[PDB]
Motif scaffolding. Structure first.
Motif, mmCIF file in Angstrom:
data_model
loop_
_atom_site.group_PDB
_atom_site.id
_atom_site.type_symbol
_atom_site.label_atom_id
_atom_site.label_comp_id
_atom_site.label_asym_id
_atom_site.label_seq_id
_atom_site.Cartn_x
_atom_site.Cartn_y
_atom_site.Cartn_z
ATOM 1 N N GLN A 112 12.378 -0.607 -1.647
ATOM 2 C CA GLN A 112 11.033 -0.849 -1.129
ATOM 3 C C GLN A 112 10.484 -2.427 -1.527
ATOM 4 O O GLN A 112 9.827 -3.307 -1.113
ATOM 5 N N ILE A 113 10.662 -2.437 -2.990
ATOM 6 C CA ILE A 113 10.203 -3.538 -3.740
ATOM 7 C C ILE A 113 11.059 -4.939 -3.471
ATOM 8 O O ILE A 113 10.730 -5.865 -3.133
ATOM 9 N N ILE A 169 0.726 -1.353 -0.070
ATOM 10 C CA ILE A 169 -0.127 0.016 -0.004
ATOM 11 C C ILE A 169 0.973 1.302 -0.045
ATOM 12 O O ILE A 169 0.475 2.136 -0.723
ATOM 13 N N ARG A 170 1.919 1.211 0.735
ATOM 14 C CA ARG A 170 2.910 2.346 0.831
ATOM 15 C C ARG A 170 3.735 2.562 -0.411
ATOM 16 O O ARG A 170 3.916 3.557 -0.926
ATOM 17 N N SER A 171 3.925 1.334 -0.751
ATOM 18 C CA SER A 171 5.028 1.336 -2.278
ATOM 19 C C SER A 171 4.114 1.692 -3.467
ATOM 20 O O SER A 171 4.684 2.460 -4.341
ATOM 21 N N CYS A 172 2.748 1.151 -3.334
ATOM 22 C CA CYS A 172 2.075 1.391 -4.469
ATOM 23 C C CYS A 172 1.619 2.989 -4.518
ATOM 24 O O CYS A 172 1.612 3.463 -5.652
ATOM 25 N N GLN A 222 8.858 -8.887 -8.856
ATOM 26 C CA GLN A 222 10.013 -8.890 -9.690
ATOM 27 C C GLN A 222 10.040 -8.410 -11.016
ATOM 28 O O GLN A 222 10.787 -7.933 -11.597
ATOM 29 N N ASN A 223 8.619 -8.423 -11.740
ATOM 30 C CA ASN A 223 8.245 -7.732 -13.026
ATOM 31 C C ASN A 223 8.491 -6.241 -12.692
ATOM 32 O O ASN A 223 9.156 -5.657 -13.411
ATOM 33 N N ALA A 224 7.997 -5.792 -11.629
ATOM 34 C CA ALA A 224 8.021 -4.457 -11.170
ATOM 35 C C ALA A 224 9.415 -3.940 -11.168
ATOM 36 O O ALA A 224 9.947 -2.774 -11.496
ATOM 37 N N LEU A 225 10.048 -4.880 -10.635
ATOM 38 C CA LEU A 225 11.489 -4.329 -10.109
ATOM 39 C C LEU A 225 12.196 -4.455 -11.348
ATOM 40 O O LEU A 225 13.221 -3.297 -11.352
ATOM 41 N N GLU A 226 12.228 -5.326 -12.302
ATOM 42 C CA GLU A 226 12.969 -5.237 -13.597
ATOM 43 C C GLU A 226 12.519 -4.148 -14.637
ATOM 44 O O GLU A 226 13.462 -3.647 -15.215
#
Ligand SMILES: Nc1nc2c(ncn2[C@@H]2O[C@H](COP(=O)(O)OP(=O)(O)CP(=O)(O)O)[C@@H](O)[C@H]2O)c(=O)[nH]1
Ligand SMILES: Nc1nc2c(ncn2[C@@H]2O[C@H](COP(=O)(O)OP(=O)(O)CP(=O)(O)O)[C@@H](O)[C@H]2O)c(=O)[nH]1
Ligand SMILES: [Mg+2]
Ligand SMILES: [Mg+2]
Lengths: 428, 428
Positions: free
Chosen positions: A203-204, A175-178, A378-382
């Protein structure tokens, strides 16, 4: 002078205690106007303190009547506002533990306005009215049906909501990262120093090894939940049935580790026991057959079990031979004779020891949804490393969060709810 | 500010609900300072309303703790002064219905000061402290283990104390009849007209057909209690085992009548089923053998059962033959095939119909003591007709009364108490 209680479902009834003979049994009922219904069959001994106008958590001694006929002498416990298992008003008649009596008590409830409860309905209502989350509702059933100290202990940890607090921790982290990227997508010119990209990639990453740790728990927790799936394989007349029977589809416990026996689910089985008719096998150099199976399932632990040790004379040379020409460990056994079975089990319980205090995850739904959660994380991370649009990055964090919520029932499915609560015994 | 409560026994504990899985289970404890002991393991959720200083018939929601470790989430019901099953103070923790959990709950009680309850101990204490009489204590166990509508219904009648009020009626009749002669033996010259001899001979006679009526109940009540003892007799390989197995020592129910099957208790068996290998019997004119058994037990009902009807071609002529040359009724059967078994049972349930509203007496102890009661009553009755001493007549009425009291436990034996309560499951 009342509150905002959840609209109660149709009045249901079921026998809550196991089937069989015993000193006492419980028939429980829950739903709308349940104690009004109970009042119509229950007679308090002294005066007439109506059950409906009674306080919560108060027991009442009396008799159940089917009109003129007495049914039993019972204690009736009254549960009130949201303060009960199903959060609706309920009453549990605890009565004499006889099949005939308890059965006759149930029909009295059914004949008087209760519909028979469905598999898990009680626990489902607990979840649905928000007194319990889907994890805790799963844990209840797991604790009842548990067959191990570990199995039971893990259920307790989960019924407390140990996993649940651990998840709500990630839920609010997401929620915070979003909401960090969702602020980047409000923008219009909003670059307020204190960088967004660096602060978030970490954070991710924190949230990823958080989730991955929990994914590794299943590796172990599955064995805790449903034991070790062991297949007894052999030949026509190697003594498979006789071994299975003396060891006890159905399964046994040994050295506080549960073993699930079975007879195709060869691939994806933790322990394979290969049984051969020691010596008496007409064509014996079929230890190639036993070498091929070991080579066909490297993921498994393997033990060769030389059966019918009582018919065979010099067995030590035959065991050593089989052990040599297969590259497996061989245990000498007599299945009808029950000879050295305790040696077999002491060996069986050895690769079932796998490579500490921390929260576990039981059966794959949690596991599977945690995988998807990790993938999206990890999709978001990449996606950040590749410098792509905020819209796509924020859209993976949404997907991650939705998966985490999925496991605590935050996102309902009502078909997942069925495959869960269909396994439940009639009466919670 | 308290009363005269019966000195409570050592604190005991047992699982009160059947063994197996279910939504809930009860572990119950009773004895001296039981709720003080419970207070040391039970933690009420909100503040700390001590369980010991709580009122009777009040439920308390909380958790059982083994020091630091949680054991389960339970409701704890508090029973107080004489107002409980055992008339001592007790508490019943109702908890999650899992073998592991409930087992772990029991050990928590045991480790904390409770001795494990003995077979029937709970119900025994009920009797011993006078909340229940020996008949009612017998009825409790009978109701739990009952296997018939009739069996259950009779237990209810007895647990109410229907027989008990009926006996207390004779008890006070004997007391009245007893004290009449005991006034004749004070005497010294006491002939106060209003004759003693006529008024009493009838008082004994009223009480005799009173008792004899109850003796006749057993004739029927035994069948209600333990069914119909049926013996399956035959030859080597007549199919006895296969018949016994498909019909279900162990026993079955049919058309609301229980049948006790068995394999020497031939004499004193209500129904004898003679099984023969239809045709396939190497020497067939062994229907003399079946005629001799019928002639050897005239007290029984007899049915010849021609088995293996599926192997045999023309069977109607063979059945009619066997029926002719034995003077019995023959039923055609295939035991592995399950063929016409429903015809067999419809025939089986026919002499088990024996020659109305009124109180019954179950298993022989009551029966036997009622016999002795009758004998003494009739000894006394005859003794008047023979004009013998008052001392001898008053001494038979004493014996009669003592026998009647024997059945309600009025005269304790504490070896009779054992043969009764040893049959009881651990936990009442
Ligand atoms: N001496 C000895 N004989 C055994 C032993 N176990 C089985 N047998 C014999 O061999 C037979 C094997 O039967 P079973 O136990 O059903 O083996 P199975 O491999 O399940 C037969 P299938 O391959 O059809 O399933 C038995 O009938 C028994 O007579 C043993 O430990 N010792
Ligand atoms: N065709 C047919 N064969 C049967 C039937 N019942 C039994 N058999 C055969 O006869 C044999 C009888 O075995 P069992 O049922 O043990 O009879 P039993 O009289 O108990 C043997 P024992 O006298 O040793 O106790 C079985 O092995 C079966 O093959 C039947 O109803 N129909
Ligand atoms: Mg087999
Ligand atoms: Mg047999």
């Amino acid at each position: 002078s009342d509150l905002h209680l959840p609209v109660p479902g149709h009045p249901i009834a079921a026998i809550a205690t196991p089937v069989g003979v015993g000193a006492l049994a419980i028939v429980r009922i829950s739903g709308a106007g349940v104690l009004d219904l109970a009042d119509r069959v229950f007679r308090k001994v002294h005066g007439s303190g109506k059950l409906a106008e009674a306080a919560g958590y108060t027991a009442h001694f009396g008799r159940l009547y089917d009109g003129e006929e007495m049914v039993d002498e019972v204690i009736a416990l009254v549960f009130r506002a949201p303060r009960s298992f199903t959060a609706e008003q309920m009453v549990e008649f605890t009565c004499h533990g006889g099949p005939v009596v308890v059965g006759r008590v149930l029909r009295l409830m059914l004949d008087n306005g209760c519909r028979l409860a469905e598999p898990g309905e009680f626990t489902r209502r607990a979840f649905l009215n928000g007194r319990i989350d889907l994890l805790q509702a799963e844990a209840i059933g797991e604790m009842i049906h548990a067959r191990t100290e570990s199995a039971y202990r893990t259920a307790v940890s989960q019924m407390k909501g140990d996993l649940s607090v651990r998840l709500g921790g990630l839920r609010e982290q997401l929620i915070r990262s979003c909401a960090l990227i969702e602020l980047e997508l409000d923008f219009s010119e909003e670059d307020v120093e204190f960088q967004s990209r660096d602060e978030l990639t970490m954070q991710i990453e924190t949230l990823r090894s958080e989730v991955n740790r929990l994914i590794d728990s299943y590796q172990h927790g599955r064995i805790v939940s449903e034991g070790v799936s062991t297949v007894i394989a052999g030949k026509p007349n190697a003594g498979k049935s006789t071994l299975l029977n003396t060891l006890l589809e159905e399964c046994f416990i040994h050295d506080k580790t549960m073993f699930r026996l079975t007879d195709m689910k060869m691939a994806e089985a933790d322990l394979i026991l290969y049984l051969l008719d020691l010596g008496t096998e007409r064509l014996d150099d079929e230890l190639t057959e036993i070498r091929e199976l070991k080579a066909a399932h490297p993921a498994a632990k393997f033990l060769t079990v030389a059966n019918k040790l009582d018919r065979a004379a010099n067995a030590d040379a035959l065991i050593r031979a089989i052990a040599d020409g297969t590259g497996t460990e061989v245990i000498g056994i007599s299945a009808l004779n029950g000879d050295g079975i305790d040696t077999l089990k002491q060996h069986m319980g050895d690769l079932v020891k796998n490579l500490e205090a921390s929260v576990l995850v039981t059966s794959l739904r949690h596991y599977e949804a945690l995988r998807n959660a990790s993938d999206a994380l990890q999709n978001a991370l990449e996606l950040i490393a590749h410098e792509s649009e905020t819209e796509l990055i924020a859209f993976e964090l949404r997907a991650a969060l939705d998966y985490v919520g999925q496991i605590t029932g935050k996102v309902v499915n009502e078909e997942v709810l069925n495959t869960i609560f269909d396994k439940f015994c009639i009466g919670k």
